[PDB]
Short mmCIF file of all heavy atoms in Angstrom, two decimals:
data_model
loop_
_atom_site.label_atom_id
_atom_site.label_comp_id
_atom_site.label_asym_id
_atom_site.label_seq_id
_atom_site.Cartn_x
_atom_site.Cartn_y
_atom_site.Cartn_z
N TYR A 1333 2.04 14.36 10.80
CA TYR A 1333 1.73 15.27 9.72
C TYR A 1333 0.24 15.56 9.72
O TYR A 1333 -0.57 14.80 10.24
CB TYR A 1333 2.18 14.72 8.36
CG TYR A 1333 1.22 13.72 7.76
CD1 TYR A 1333 0.38 14.08 6.73
CD2 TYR A 1333 1.16 12.42 8.23
CE1 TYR A 1333 -0.50 13.17 6.17
CE2 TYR A 1333 0.29 11.50 7.69
CZ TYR A 1333 -0.54 11.88 6.66
OH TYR A 1333 -1.41 10.97 6.11
N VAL A 1334 -0.12 16.69 9.11
CA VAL A 1334 -1.51 17.11 9.01
C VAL A 1334 -2.09 16.57 7.71
O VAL A 1334 -1.55 16.82 6.63
CB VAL A 1334 -1.63 18.64 9.08
CG1 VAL A 1334 -3.06 19.07 8.81
CG2 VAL A 1334 -1.16 19.14 10.43
N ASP A 1335 -3.19 15.84 7.81
CA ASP A 1335 -3.84 15.23 6.66
C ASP A 1335 -5.04 16.06 6.24
O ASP A 1335 -5.93 16.34 7.06
CB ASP A 1335 -4.28 13.80 6.99
CG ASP A 1335 -4.42 12.93 5.75
OD1 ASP A 1335 -3.39 12.67 5.09
OD2 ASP A 1335 -5.55 12.50 5.46
N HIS A 1336 -5.06 16.48 4.98
CA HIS A 1336 -6.09 17.37 4.45
C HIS A 1336 -7.06 16.63 3.54
O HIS A 1336 -7.58 17.20 2.58
CB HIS A 1336 -5.45 18.54 3.71
CG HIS A 1336 -4.51 19.35 4.54
ND1 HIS A 1336 -4.93 20.41 5.32
CD2 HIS A 1336 -3.17 19.26 4.71
CE1 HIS A 1336 -3.88 20.93 5.94
NE2 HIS A 1336 -2.81 20.26 5.58
N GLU A 1337 -7.32 15.37 3.83
CA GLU A 1337 -8.31 14.62 3.06
C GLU A 1337 -9.71 15.05 3.44
O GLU A 1337 -9.95 15.60 4.52
CB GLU A 1337 -8.14 13.12 3.27
CG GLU A 1337 -8.60 12.63 4.63
CD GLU A 1337 -8.99 11.16 4.62
OE1 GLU A 1337 -9.07 10.57 3.52
OE2 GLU A 1337 -9.21 10.60 5.71
N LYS A 1338 -10.66 14.77 2.53
CA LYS A 1338 -12.09 15.05 2.68
C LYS A 1338 -12.38 16.39 3.35
O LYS A 1338 -13.32 16.50 4.14
CB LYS A 1338 -12.80 13.91 3.44
CG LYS A 1338 -12.17 13.46 4.75
CD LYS A 1338 -12.98 13.91 5.95
CE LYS A 1338 -12.41 13.35 7.25
NZ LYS A 1338 -13.12 13.89 8.44
N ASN A 1339 -11.59 17.41 3.01
CA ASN A 1339 -11.80 18.78 3.49
C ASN A 1339 -11.82 18.85 5.02
O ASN A 1339 -12.56 19.62 5.62
CB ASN A 1339 -13.09 19.37 2.91
CG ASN A 1339 -13.06 20.88 2.82
OD1 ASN A 1339 -12.13 21.53 3.31
ND2 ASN A 1339 -14.07 21.45 2.19
N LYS A 1340 -10.98 18.04 5.66
CA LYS A 1340 -10.92 18.01 7.12
C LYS A 1340 -9.50 17.71 7.56
O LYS A 1340 -8.88 16.77 7.07
CB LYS A 1340 -11.89 16.96 7.69
CG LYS A 1340 -12.06 17.05 9.19
CD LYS A 1340 -12.48 18.44 9.62
CE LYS A 1340 -13.97 18.66 9.40
NZ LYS A 1340 -14.52 19.70 10.32
N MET A 1341 -8.99 18.52 8.49
CA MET A 1341 -7.64 18.37 8.98
C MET A 1341 -7.58 17.32 10.09
O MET A 1341 -8.53 17.14 10.85
CB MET A 1341 -7.10 19.70 9.50
CG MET A 1341 -7.11 20.82 8.47
SD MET A 1341 -5.75 21.98 8.69
CE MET A 1341 -6.49 23.48 8.07
N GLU A 1342 -6.44 16.64 10.17
CA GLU A 1342 -6.22 15.64 11.21
C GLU A 1342 -4.73 15.35 11.30
O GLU A 1342 -4.03 15.34 10.29
CB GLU A 1342 -6.99 14.35 10.92
CG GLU A 1342 -7.03 13.38 12.09
CD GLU A 1342 -7.83 12.13 11.78
OE1 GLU A 1342 -8.69 12.19 10.88
OE2 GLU A 1342 -7.60 11.10 12.44
N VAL A 1343 -4.25 15.13 12.53
CA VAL A 1343 -2.85 14.81 12.76
C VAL A 1343 -2.70 13.29 12.78
O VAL A 1343 -3.33 12.61 13.59
CB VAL A 1343 -2.35 15.42 14.08
CG1 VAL A 1343 -1.02 14.81 14.47
CG2 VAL A 1343 -2.24 16.92 13.96
N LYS A 1344 -1.87 12.77 11.87
CA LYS A 1344 -1.65 11.34 11.75
C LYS A 1344 -0.16 11.05 11.72
O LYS A 1344 0.63 11.86 11.24
CB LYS A 1344 -2.31 10.77 10.49
CG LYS A 1344 -3.58 11.50 10.06
CD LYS A 1344 -4.31 10.74 8.97
CE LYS A 1344 -5.51 9.99 9.52
NZ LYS A 1344 -6.31 9.37 8.43
N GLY A 1345 0.21 9.88 12.23
CA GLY A 1345 1.60 9.48 12.20
C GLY A 1345 2.06 9.10 10.80
O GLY A 1345 1.27 8.68 9.95
N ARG A 1346 3.35 9.27 10.56
CA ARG A 1346 3.95 8.96 9.27
C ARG A 1346 4.40 7.51 9.27
O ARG A 1346 5.17 7.09 10.14
CB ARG A 1346 5.13 9.89 8.98
CG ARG A 1346 4.73 11.26 8.49
CD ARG A 1346 5.93 12.07 8.05
NE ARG A 1346 5.62 13.49 7.97
CZ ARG A 1346 6.33 14.44 8.57
NH1 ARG A 1346 7.39 14.16 9.30
NH2 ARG A 1346 5.95 15.71 8.43
N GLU A 1347 3.93 6.74 8.28
CA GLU A 1347 4.24 5.33 8.18
C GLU A 1347 4.87 5.05 6.82
O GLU A 1347 4.36 5.49 5.79
CB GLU A 1347 2.98 4.48 8.35
CG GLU A 1347 2.66 4.12 9.79
CD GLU A 1347 1.18 4.19 10.10
OE1 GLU A 1347 0.40 4.50 9.18
OE2 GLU A 1347 0.79 3.93 11.26
N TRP A 1348 5.98 4.32 6.82
CA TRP A 1348 6.66 3.90 5.60
C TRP A 1348 6.12 2.54 5.22
O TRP A 1348 6.66 1.50 5.61
CB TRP A 1348 8.17 3.89 5.80
CG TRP A 1348 8.94 3.50 4.57
CD1 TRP A 1348 9.60 2.33 4.36
CD2 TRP A 1348 9.15 4.30 3.40
NE1 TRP A 1348 10.20 2.34 3.13
CE2 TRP A 1348 9.94 3.54 2.52
CE3 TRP A 1348 8.75 5.58 3.02
CZ2 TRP A 1348 10.34 4.03 1.28
CZ3 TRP A 1348 9.14 6.06 1.78
CH2 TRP A 1348 9.92 5.29 0.93
N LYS A 1349 5.04 2.53 4.46
CA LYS A 1349 4.31 1.31 4.15
C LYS A 1349 4.72 0.76 2.79
O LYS A 1349 5.43 1.41 2.02
CB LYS A 1349 2.80 1.56 4.19
CG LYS A 1349 2.23 1.68 5.59
CD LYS A 1349 1.00 2.57 5.60
CE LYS A 1349 -0.25 1.76 5.85
NZ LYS A 1349 -1.48 2.60 5.78
N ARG A 1350 4.30 -0.47 2.53
CA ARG A 1350 4.50 -1.13 1.25
C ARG A 1350 3.15 -1.44 0.63
O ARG A 1350 2.17 -1.69 1.33
CB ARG A 1350 5.31 -2.42 1.43
CG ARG A 1350 5.59 -3.18 0.14
CD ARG A 1350 6.62 -4.26 0.34
NE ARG A 1350 6.19 -5.26 1.30
CZ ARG A 1350 6.95 -6.24 1.77
NH1 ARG A 1350 8.21 -6.37 1.38
NH2 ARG A 1350 6.45 -7.10 2.65
N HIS A 1351 3.10 -1.40 -0.70
CA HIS A 1351 1.87 -1.75 -1.40
C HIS A 1351 1.49 -3.19 -1.09
O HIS A 1351 2.36 -4.05 -0.87
CB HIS A 1351 2.04 -1.55 -2.90
CG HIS A 1351 2.18 -0.11 -3.30
ND1 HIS A 1351 1.34 0.88 -2.84
CD2 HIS A 1351 3.06 0.50 -4.13
CE1 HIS A 1351 1.70 2.04 -3.36
NE2 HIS A 1351 2.75 1.83 -4.14
N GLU A 1352 0.19 -3.46 -1.07
CA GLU A 1352 -0.30 -4.75 -0.61
C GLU A 1352 0.19 -5.88 -1.50
O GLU A 1352 0.57 -6.95 -1.00
CB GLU A 1352 -1.83 -4.73 -0.54
CG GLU A 1352 -2.39 -3.93 0.62
CD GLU A 1352 -2.47 -4.73 1.91
OE1 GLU A 1352 -1.69 -5.69 2.07
OE2 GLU A 1352 -3.33 -4.40 2.76
N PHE A 1353 0.20 -5.67 -2.81
CA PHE A 1353 0.72 -6.64 -3.76
C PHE A 1353 1.95 -6.05 -4.44
O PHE A 1353 1.86 -4.97 -5.05
CB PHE A 1353 -0.34 -7.03 -4.79
CG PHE A 1353 -1.45 -7.86 -4.22
CD1 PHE A 1353 -2.65 -7.28 -3.84
CD2 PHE A 1353 -1.29 -9.23 -4.04
CE1 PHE A 1353 -3.66 -8.05 -3.32
CE2 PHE A 1353 -2.30 -9.99 -3.52
CZ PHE A 1353 -3.49 -9.41 -3.16
N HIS A 1354 3.08 -6.74 -4.34
CA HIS A 1354 4.35 -6.21 -4.78
C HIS A 1354 5.14 -7.32 -5.46
O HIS A 1354 4.62 -8.41 -5.71
CB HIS A 1354 5.12 -5.60 -3.60
CG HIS A 1354 5.18 -6.49 -2.41
ND1 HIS A 1354 6.21 -7.39 -2.19
CD2 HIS A 1354 4.33 -6.63 -1.36
CE1 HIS A 1354 6.00 -8.03 -1.06
NE2 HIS A 1354 4.86 -7.60 -0.54
N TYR A 1355 6.41 -7.04 -5.76
CA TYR A 1355 7.32 -7.98 -6.41
C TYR A 1355 8.64 -8.05 -5.67
O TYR A 1355 9.71 -8.10 -6.28
CB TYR A 1355 7.56 -7.59 -7.86
CG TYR A 1355 6.32 -7.41 -8.71
CD1 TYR A 1355 5.63 -6.21 -8.73
CD2 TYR A 1355 5.86 -8.44 -9.51
CE1 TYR A 1355 4.51 -6.04 -9.51
CE2 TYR A 1355 4.74 -8.28 -10.29
CZ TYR A 1355 4.07 -7.08 -10.29
OH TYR A 1355 2.95 -6.92 -11.07
N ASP A 1356 8.60 -8.06 -4.34
CA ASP A 1356 9.84 -8.01 -3.56
C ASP A 1356 10.66 -9.29 -3.74
O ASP A 1356 11.89 -9.23 -3.83
CB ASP A 1356 9.53 -7.77 -2.09
CG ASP A 1356 9.64 -6.31 -1.70
OD1 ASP A 1356 9.71 -5.46 -2.61
OD2 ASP A 1356 9.67 -6.01 -0.49
N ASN A 1357 10.00 -10.44 -3.79
CA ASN A 1357 10.69 -11.69 -4.13
C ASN A 1357 9.85 -12.47 -5.13
O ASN A 1357 8.89 -11.94 -5.69
CB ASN A 1357 10.99 -12.52 -2.88
CG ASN A 1357 9.75 -12.88 -2.09
OD1 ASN A 1357 8.65 -12.96 -2.62
ND2 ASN A 1357 9.93 -13.10 -0.79
N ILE A 1358 10.20 -13.74 -5.37
CA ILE A 1358 9.52 -14.47 -6.43
C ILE A 1358 8.16 -14.99 -5.97
O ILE A 1358 7.26 -15.15 -6.80
CB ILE A 1358 10.42 -15.60 -6.96
CG1 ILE A 1358 9.91 -16.08 -8.31
CG2 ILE A 1358 10.49 -16.75 -5.97
CD1 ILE A 1358 10.81 -17.08 -8.96
N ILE A 1359 7.98 -15.25 -4.68
CA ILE A 1359 6.69 -15.72 -4.20
C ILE A 1359 5.66 -14.60 -4.27
O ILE A 1359 4.52 -14.80 -4.73
CB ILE A 1359 6.81 -16.27 -2.77
CG1 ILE A 1359 7.91 -17.33 -2.70
CG2 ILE A 1359 5.49 -16.86 -2.31
CD1 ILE A 1359 7.70 -18.49 -3.64
N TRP A 1360 6.04 -13.39 -3.85
CA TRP A 1360 5.15 -12.25 -3.95
C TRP A 1360 4.87 -11.89 -5.39
O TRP A 1360 3.75 -11.51 -5.75
CB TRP A 1360 5.73 -11.06 -3.20
CG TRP A 1360 5.88 -11.30 -1.72
CD1 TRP A 1360 7.03 -11.17 -0.98
CD2 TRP A 1360 4.86 -11.69 -0.80
NE1 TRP A 1360 6.78 -11.47 0.33
CE2 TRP A 1360 5.45 -11.80 0.47
CE3 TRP A 1360 3.50 -11.98 -0.93
CZ2 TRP A 1360 4.74 -12.16 1.60
CZ3 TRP A 1360 2.79 -12.35 0.19
CH2 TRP A 1360 3.41 -12.44 1.44
N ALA A 1361 5.89 -12.01 -6.25
CA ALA A 1361 5.68 -11.76 -7.68
C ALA A 1361 4.70 -12.77 -8.27
O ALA A 1361 3.83 -12.40 -9.07
CB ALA A 1361 7.01 -11.82 -8.42
N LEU A 1362 4.82 -14.04 -7.88
CA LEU A 1362 3.90 -15.05 -8.38
C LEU A 1362 2.47 -14.79 -7.90
O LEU A 1362 1.52 -14.93 -8.68
CB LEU A 1362 4.36 -16.44 -7.93
CG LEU A 1362 5.45 -17.09 -8.77
CD1 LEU A 1362 5.82 -18.45 -8.21
CD2 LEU A 1362 5.02 -17.21 -10.22
N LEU A 1363 2.31 -14.39 -6.64
CA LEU A 1363 0.98 -14.08 -6.14
C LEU A 1363 0.38 -12.87 -6.86
O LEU A 1363 -0.80 -12.88 -7.23
CB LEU A 1363 1.03 -13.83 -4.63
CG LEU A 1363 -0.31 -13.59 -3.94
CD1 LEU A 1363 -1.29 -14.70 -4.24
CD2 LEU A 1363 -0.11 -13.44 -2.44
N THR A 1364 1.18 -11.82 -7.06
CA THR A 1364 0.70 -10.64 -7.77
C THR A 1364 0.30 -10.97 -9.20
O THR A 1364 -0.74 -10.52 -9.68
CB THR A 1364 1.77 -9.56 -7.76
OG1 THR A 1364 2.21 -9.33 -6.42
CG2 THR A 1364 1.22 -8.26 -8.32
N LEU A 1365 1.12 -11.78 -9.88
CA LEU A 1365 0.80 -12.15 -11.26
C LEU A 1365 -0.43 -13.06 -11.32
O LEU A 1365 -1.20 -12.97 -12.27
CB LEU A 1365 1.99 -12.84 -11.91
CG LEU A 1365 3.17 -11.92 -12.22
CD1 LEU A 1365 4.25 -12.69 -12.95
CD2 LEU A 1365 2.72 -10.72 -13.04
N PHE A 1366 -0.63 -13.92 -10.32
CA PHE A 1366 -1.85 -14.71 -10.28
C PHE A 1366 -3.08 -13.82 -10.12
O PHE A 1366 -4.09 -14.02 -10.80
CB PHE A 1366 -1.79 -15.72 -9.14
CG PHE A 1366 -3.05 -16.52 -8.96
CD1 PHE A 1366 -3.32 -17.60 -9.79
CD2 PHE A 1366 -3.95 -16.20 -7.97
CE1 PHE A 1366 -4.48 -18.33 -9.63
CE2 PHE A 1366 -5.11 -16.93 -7.81
CZ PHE A 1366 -5.37 -18.00 -8.64
N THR A 1367 -3.01 -12.83 -9.22
CA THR A 1367 -4.14 -11.92 -9.04
C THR A 1367 -4.40 -11.11 -10.31
O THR A 1367 -5.55 -10.82 -10.65
CB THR A 1367 -3.91 -11.01 -7.85
OG1 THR A 1367 -2.71 -10.26 -8.04
CG2 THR A 1367 -3.81 -11.82 -6.57
N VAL A 1368 -3.33 -10.72 -11.01
CA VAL A 1368 -3.50 -10.02 -12.28
C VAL A 1368 -4.15 -10.92 -13.32
O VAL A 1368 -5.03 -10.50 -14.08
CB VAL A 1368 -2.14 -9.47 -12.77
CG1 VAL A 1368 -2.25 -8.98 -14.20
CG2 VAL A 1368 -1.67 -8.36 -11.86
N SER A 1369 -3.72 -12.19 -13.38
CA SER A 1369 -4.28 -13.13 -14.35
C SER A 1369 -5.76 -13.38 -14.08
O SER A 1369 -6.55 -13.52 -15.03
CB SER A 1369 -3.50 -14.45 -14.30
OG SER A 1369 -4.13 -15.44 -15.08
N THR A 1370 -6.15 -13.47 -12.82
CA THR A 1370 -7.57 -13.55 -12.49
C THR A 1370 -8.31 -12.31 -12.96
O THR A 1370 -9.52 -12.36 -13.22
CB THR A 1370 -7.76 -13.76 -10.99
OG1 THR A 1370 -6.99 -14.89 -10.57
CG2 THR A 1370 -9.22 -14.01 -10.65
N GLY A 1371 -7.61 -11.19 -13.11
CA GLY A 1371 -8.20 -9.96 -13.59
C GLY A 1371 -8.66 -9.02 -12.51
O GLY A 1371 -9.37 -8.05 -12.82
#
């Protein structure tokens, strides 16, 4: 796909990514909540 960021075109591949901190299971949820609690 063509990326129109920063007023400049570029062809980049399409990636189905996941957010770095998520709640997919209970360990990831615990880590995300710990990072939130730290602020």
Side-chain angles (χ1 to χ4, degrees):
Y1333 81 103
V1334 173
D1335 204 65
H1336 303 272
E1337 73 155 350
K1338 50 107 175 175
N1339 207 352
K1340 190 55 80 155
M1341 303 212 210
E1342 192 178 337
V1343 167
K1344 328 190 103 174
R1346 281 188 197 127
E1347 272 140 1
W1348 181 252
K1349 285 151 110 184
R1350 180 168 61 188
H1351 292 312
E1352 286 275 26
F1353 289 98
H1354 49 91
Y1355 306 85
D1356 264 14
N1357 59 26
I1358 197 174
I1359 307 302
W1360 297 125
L1362 279 180
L1363 184 53
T1364 308
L1365 289 184
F1366 176 79
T1367 58
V1368 169
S1369 171
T1370 306

